[PDB]
């Protein structure tokens, strides 16, 4: 799963490269973040010319998980690497203009169409 | 709902915490030392500017806003918690004035701007903070510094885009009913409205403007003795100042004289309102059933000599209401300076 103090990659071109999931949203005693969830991240590595800087705190949406995603027919969607899309703090909207890599269909269920629309895969 | 300025507020900063004179005694240590936690910092009252608000109706009762007492310093080096900040919701453009040698602390500029009005009291140091070689068992305690007792006056100017100026016989209040749904008091007697009221004209979802009606003024209003000229202070912010003139007034019977009497005190309020592009329209058209209506309109328009575009409307129902609003909004677009 995805929990606090977890190194995270980025699935967008916002400017970050490595972030830290350090707080997961959703309710009290929230232990894990699934494939579609709102999490709080801190930038650990970013391009100096990018739209975001080092140490910034903002919201992210999970895209890919190591453990996988359980389909209603006992099918898992595993991945090699954990990635997220960065969002503005006040409004949950994508910051990056593109998505790099595959995205699961589960984001469609939770009404995340910004990531699904401009993603050149599933 | 309605627009009322000149709100007053009393705010007090949270008093600083109080330290405690306590000593530490343990199982094998009869002489442990002065162990008394310091107090907590007092609460702080803040100011916040929101775009949504445009009135001070919530502060015409001048409630007393309390920042909670700072938590007293507890024994065993337990520091008291600071009181939570108190934030008061304030519109944009308000003036902040103190009672007694008061000055403008700050002017609201944009949404989210924060202004400090009263800083909380400092915490009271416990006996842990006063031990030394001279005195090894400090019994002295310091009271927290008191909070700031301050009187606040809030002055707000009108945020409307269109302001009305006309005689009490003119249908200023009833024109709001024709252009919006605000339901102000309308009757056949002078000085029906006592305070300015707001109104929003939304003919399309994308575009809209705010229009406010202002209480009527008389010949003698210039020097005073009536409602004064103080209600024209809520102007100079409107992009356009619509002017209503009552054709063939029932009790006036002097259309030529009273048409230009508005400009008389308009040129004498503070700076003649910088001669902003005030229009000129007539009302009570339905009273004149036929061609006599606009026949007199040109007769009374040539007396002023302005000769610019004039609109013949009746505030009772339609008849130019639906087309004058578009032209008012058209003027708004090319001029974005407020």
């Amino acid at each position: 799963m995805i929990q606090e103090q977890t190194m995270l990659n980025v699935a967008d071109n916002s400017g970050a490269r490595r972030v830290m999931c350090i707080k997961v949203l959703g309710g009290s005693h929230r232990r894990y973040a699934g494939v579609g969830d709102i999490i709080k991240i801190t930038i650990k590595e970013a391009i100096p010319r990018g739209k975001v800087k080092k140490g910034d705190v903002l919201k992210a949406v999970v895209v890919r998980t190591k453990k996988g995603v359980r389909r209603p027919d006992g099918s898992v969607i595993r991945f090699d690497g954990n990635a997220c899309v960065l969002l503005n703090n006040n409004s949950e909207q994508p910051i990056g203009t593109r998505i790099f890599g595959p995205v699961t269909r589960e984001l469609r269920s939770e009404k995340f169409m910004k990531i699904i629309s401009l993603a050149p895969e599933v | 709902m309605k627009f009322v300025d000149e709100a007053s507020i009393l705010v007090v900063a949270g008093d600083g915490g109080n330290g405690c004179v306590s000593f530490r005694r343990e199982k094998y240590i009869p002489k442990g030392g002065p162990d008394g936690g310091d107090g907590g910092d007092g609460g702080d009252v803040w100011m916040e500017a929101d775009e949504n608000l445009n009135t001070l109706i919530d502060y015409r009762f001048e409630k007393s806003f309390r920042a909670e007492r700072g938590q007293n310093g507890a024994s065993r080096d337990c520091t008291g918690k600071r009181g939570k900040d108190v934030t008061i919701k304030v519109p944009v453009g308000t003036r902040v004035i103190d009672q007694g040698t008061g000055e403008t602390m700050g002017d609201m500029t944009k949404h989210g701007q924060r202004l400090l009005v009263a800083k909380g009291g400092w915490h009271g140091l416990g006996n842990t903070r006063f031990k030394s070689s001279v005195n090894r068992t400090p019994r002295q305690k310091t009271n927290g510094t008191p909070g700031d007792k301050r009187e606040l006056l809030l002055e707000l100017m009108l945020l409307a885009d269109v302001g009305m100026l006309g005689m009490p016989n003119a249908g200023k209040s009833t024109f709001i009913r024709a252009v919006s749904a605000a339901k102000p008091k309308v009757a056949d007697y002078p000085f029906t409205t006592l305070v300015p009221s707001l109104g929003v004209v939304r003919m399309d979802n994308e575009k809209s403007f705010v229009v406010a009606d202002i209480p009527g003024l008389i010949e003698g209003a210039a020097e005073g003795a009536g409602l004064g000229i103080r209600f024209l202070k809520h102007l100079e912010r409107c992009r356009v100042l619509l002017h209503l003139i009552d054709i063939d007034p029932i009790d006036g019977t002097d259309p030529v004289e009273n048409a230009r009497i508005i400009i008389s005190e308009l040129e004498k309020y503070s700076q003649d309102l910088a001669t902003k592009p005030r229009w000129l329209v007539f009302n009570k058209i339905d009273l004149l059933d036929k061609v006599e209506a606009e026949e007199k309109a040109k007769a009374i328009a040539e007396a002023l000599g302005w000769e610019d575009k004039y609109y013949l409307i009746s505030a009772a129902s339609g008849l130019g209401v639906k087309d004058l609003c578009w032209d008012v909004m058209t003027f708004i677009i090319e001029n974005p300076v407020v």
Binding site: - | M1, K2, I57, D58, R60, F61
Partner: protein, 176 residues
């Protein structure tokens, strides 16, 4: 006590039966029966009903006068009847009666249905007007309170249900 010093008189065509401490005032407008407190006595006499207490009771005349009040309303309800007036004020407020049930629409998300007692009837001369007809003043008062409790008026606009003669407070409230 001193109210009970004035005995009541029953009109013509009213039958009164005493079977111990139970009083029946059955007549033109239905049949009703009430049990007493076992401490106040009513004596059969000429066309007039009197009340008195029992010796050795602390309350004495204090509670005897109570029966003089309730029995007074009993003869009124069996000859003249009891009328209760309730009116609806506010948009989206409608009232209708279907048999022994009043249909209510008071801005809720579901219709409101009320079941009436056996001896209570209601009429709707207007969509915002309900009139209650009954034989006992206590029963209609409870029914009127039940209707009122759903939408007790607020003092800002007066929306809700109210009695015809009831006056409600009006507040010129302006803040927030």
């Amino acid at each position: 006590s001193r109210v009970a010093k004035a005995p009541v008189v029953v009109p013509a065509g009213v039958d009164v039966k005493i079977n111990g401490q139970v009083i029946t005032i059955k007549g033109k407008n239905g049949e009703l029966t009430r049990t007493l407190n076992d401490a106040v006595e009513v004596k059969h006499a000429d066309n007039t009903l009197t009340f008195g207490p029992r010796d050795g009771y602390a309350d004495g005349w204090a509670q005897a006068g109570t029966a003089r009040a309730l029995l007074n309303s009993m003869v009124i309800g069996v000859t003249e009847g009891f009328t209760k007036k309730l009116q609806l004020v506010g948009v989206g407020y409608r009232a209708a009666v279907k048999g022994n049930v009043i249909n209510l629409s008071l801005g809720f998300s579901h219709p409101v249905d009320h079941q009436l007692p056996a001896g209570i009837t209601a009429e709707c001369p207007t969509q915002t007007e309900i009139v209650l007809k009954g034989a006992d003043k206590q029963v209609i008062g409870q029914v009127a309170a039940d209707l009122r409790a759903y939408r007790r008026p607020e003092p800002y606009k007066g929306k809700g249900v109210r009695y015809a003669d009831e006056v409600v407070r009006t507040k010129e409230a302006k803040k927030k």
